[PDB]
């Protein structure tokens, strides 16, 4: 009972968790529940690999399932970690199963950081182990036959799968054993042996000789093709080649022998003899040439008896001419076997440790989408603010709308009064003064954090250097200096930001001292404010004039244009679409994810009404500014230039400008403060890293 089986590949143990957990934490919340399960999966995973590949080799279905499970799990991980770029480097080291090499030596090894390589080797071991479990089965027993058939077919499919994937899975050339041609040959050997098992079942079940001859002939055809492949390319262990040659002949003989019984039953006595002679010749050759590998004594006796009996009857009774072999018809062929497809899960009762984990492809698309969503939202918002800023600057330069509200040059025009009261309510000048005052204190807070952080590093390093200098033998560690270069690289960037923040401060400060006085005036109680605003004569051309009403409507509309910008900006910021589903659908429905066309399409649907309206604001303002510009210069002819009115106009213009300045200043300062406050949160984290690292030392 000699069946071919394949030996398991050897691999060196590697740390599975490490590069996995490293990535895990990089991509999730510290202490966050992710780690809680994911890191616990990557742990159980490494133990699996060791169990599936480190263990001494056990021909136990339990041991085979563990290997199958490991192939399943390993496959289930590919989408959920960024192996492709390979910045994620975990290296897999396997040895050739057969100690085969293109160059002359004993054994050839190969370490690759390609999960594709790992996958092929695991599957190979799955195939090889299955082939060993099959070769051990008791074939005089129905269960043994079922088990042997199933495993040989599994092995056949696994090997063939390896053949079809191996090269795409690998950058460089494979070790021989898993090379496409080696695994193609093994695949066919496994299939032949499965066909053999069905021939034995057929025999044991005493099926018709017609069937048995066809099953056996199909086996012959399988073993014969495998033989041919091996005939000029010796990449399998030494006993494989002779065994194939033997099994090819034995299966041919079986086919002849059963076909001869059929001939006999049809009174084709000459054919019967010719076929039994072919069978005797085949089995005779096997007995002497491959006795090292097979035992055909019982079969040889059986043939011999059938031939002697047949020659007797023919020589005395039938007198039938014995045909030449070339004149006989082919025995047909019937296959009952198929290479089993590898579709994970190939293990029983599988459960993907990382099923919850989100496919890398989708996160790459979610991140991408957000860089697009930010750009859309920020862009439109900035477009709107710059436009509003531009128009306020234009209206002030024209004394609008003050000029139209100033019917009596005696009193504070209503729009100035509204603005005054608005500012006073917002705290007045105190508001600005306070923000300005503590700007330098927020800077100082941050410098201090940064400085203390770097001092930690400096101090420890200082003792590290001393210790190495005095205790060379006893103090041998990577020098703190080396270890700290990364954190000090952060340090220098932080420092670069702070240098810029200082400049941003100096700019806002200078701009604040350049407008403080006029803002102080704006904030006076109304009578005191009126008293400081030079009076002038009015002109009745104010009451009912056309230019005034035209200008007023233009101004009212422009006002509606800028008040609308508030709701638009807020609607821009308050909405969002979670794109996870859209990406997962694309990925399950399809093989790949193209976010660009997807992002664009969803963005357009979520933000398109708004982005459109924003664009209308801008063009609408444009129209308005040209119109008021022309209408004013006309309104200008109407009014009269004297030093009194000139002086009033200068103060009104300056008062409107002071309102806009107060608005901008408060906003630029609160943006400054937020920056310093957020920078403190980051510097506090940075300071912890420095503490941690100085104390792990």
């Amino acid at each position: 009972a000699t069946f071919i089986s394949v030996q398991l590949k050897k691999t060196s143990e590697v740390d599975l968790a490490k590069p996995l957990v490293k990535f895990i934490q990089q991509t999730y919340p510290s202490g966050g529940e992710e780690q809680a399960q994911y890191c616990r999966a990557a742990e159980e995973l490494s133990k699996l690999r060791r169990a599936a590949v480190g263990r001494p080799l056990d021909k136990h279905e339990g041991a085979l399932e563990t290997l199958l499970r490991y192939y399943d799990q390993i496959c289930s991980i590919e989408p959920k970690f960024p192996f492709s770029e390979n910045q994620i480097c975990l290296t897999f080291t396997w040895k050739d199963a057969f100690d085969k090499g293109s160059l002359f030596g004993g054994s050839v090894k190969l370490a690759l950081a390609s999960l594709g390589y790992e996958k092929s080797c695991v599957l190979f071991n799955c195939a090889a182990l299955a082939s060993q479990i099959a070769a051990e089965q008791n074939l005089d027993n129905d269960e043994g036959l079922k088990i042997a058939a199933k495993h040989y077919q599994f092995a056949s499919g696994a090997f063939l799968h390896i053949k079809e994937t191996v090269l795409s899975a690998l950058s460089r050339e494979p070790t021989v054993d898993i090379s496409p041609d080696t695994v193609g040959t093994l695949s066919l050997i496994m299939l032949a042996q499965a066909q053999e098992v069905f021939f034995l079942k057929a025999t044991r079940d005493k099926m018709k000789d017609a069937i048995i001859a066809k099953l056996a002939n199909q086996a012959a055809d399988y073993f014969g093709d495998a033989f041919k492949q091996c005939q000029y390319k010796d990449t399998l262990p030494k006993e494989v080649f002779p065994v194939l040659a033997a099994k090819h002949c034995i299966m041919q003989a079986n086919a002849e022998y059963h076909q001869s019984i059929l001939a006999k039953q049809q009174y084709y006595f000459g054919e019967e003899i010719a076929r039994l002679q072919h069978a005797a010749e085949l089995i005779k050759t096997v007995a002497s040439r491959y006795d090292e590998y097979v035992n055909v004594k019982d079969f040889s006796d059986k043939i011999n008896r059938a031939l002697a009996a047949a020659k007797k009857d023919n020589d005395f009774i039938y007198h039938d001419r014995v045909p030449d072999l070339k004149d006989l018809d082919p025995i047909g062929k019937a296959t009952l076997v198929k290479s089993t497809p590898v579709n994970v899960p190939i293990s029983q009762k599988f459960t993907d440790l990382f099923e919850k984990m989100v496919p890398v492809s989708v996160q790459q698309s979610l991140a991408a989408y957000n860089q697009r969503k930010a750009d859309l939202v920020n862009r439109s918002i900035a477009q709107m603010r710059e436009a509003t800023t531009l128009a306020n600057g234009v209206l002030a330069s024209l004394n609008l709308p003050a000029a139209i509200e100033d019917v009596s040059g005696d009193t504070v025009p209503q729009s100035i009064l509204t603005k005054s009261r608005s500012v006073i309510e917002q705290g007045g000048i105190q508001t600005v003064d306070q923000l300005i005052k503590e700007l330098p204190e927020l800077l100082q807070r941050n410098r201090e954090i940064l400085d203390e952080s770097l001092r930690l590093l400096d101090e420890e390093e200082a003792t590290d250097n001393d210790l190495r200098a005095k205790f060379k033998e006893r103090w041998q560690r990577t020098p703190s200096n080396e270890l700290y270069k990364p954190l000090r690289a952060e340090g220098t960037n932080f420092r670069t930001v702070l240098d810029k923040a200082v400049q941003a401060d100096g700019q806002v400060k200078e701009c604040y001292q350049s407008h403080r006085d006029t803002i102080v005036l704006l904030c006076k109680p109304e009578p005191e404010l009126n008293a400081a605003i030079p009076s002038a004569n009015p002109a009745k051309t104010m009451q009912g004039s056309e230019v005034v009403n035209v200008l007023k409507s233009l101004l009212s509309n422009l006002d509606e244009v800028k008040k609308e910008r508030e709701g638009l900006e807020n609607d821009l910021k308050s909405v969002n679409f979670d794109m996870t589903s859209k990406f997962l659908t694309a990925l399950a429905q399809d093989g790949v994810i193209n976010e660009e066309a997807l992002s664009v399409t969803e963005l357009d649907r979520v933000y398109g009404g708004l982005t459109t309206k924003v664009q209308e604001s801008l063009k609408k303002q444009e129209g308005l500014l040209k119109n008021i510009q022309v209408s004013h210069q006309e309104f200008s002819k109407m009014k009269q230039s004297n030093n009194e009115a000139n002086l009033r106009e200068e103060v009104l213009k300056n008062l409107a400008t002071a309102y806009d300045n107060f608005v901008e200043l408060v906003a630029n300062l609160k943006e400054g403060t937020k920056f310093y406050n957020e920078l403190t949160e980051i510097l506090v984290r940075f300071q912890n890293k420095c503490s941690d690292i100085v104390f792990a030392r």
Binding site: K500, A501, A504, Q507, N668, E671, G672, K674, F675, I682
Partner: peptide, 15 residues
């Protein structure tokens, strides 16, 4: 053009 624009951008980059 806003004094803290660039500095605010540098911050996100890191945070």
């Amino acid at each position: 053009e806003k004094p803290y624009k660039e500095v605010t951008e540098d911050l996100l980059h890191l945070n």
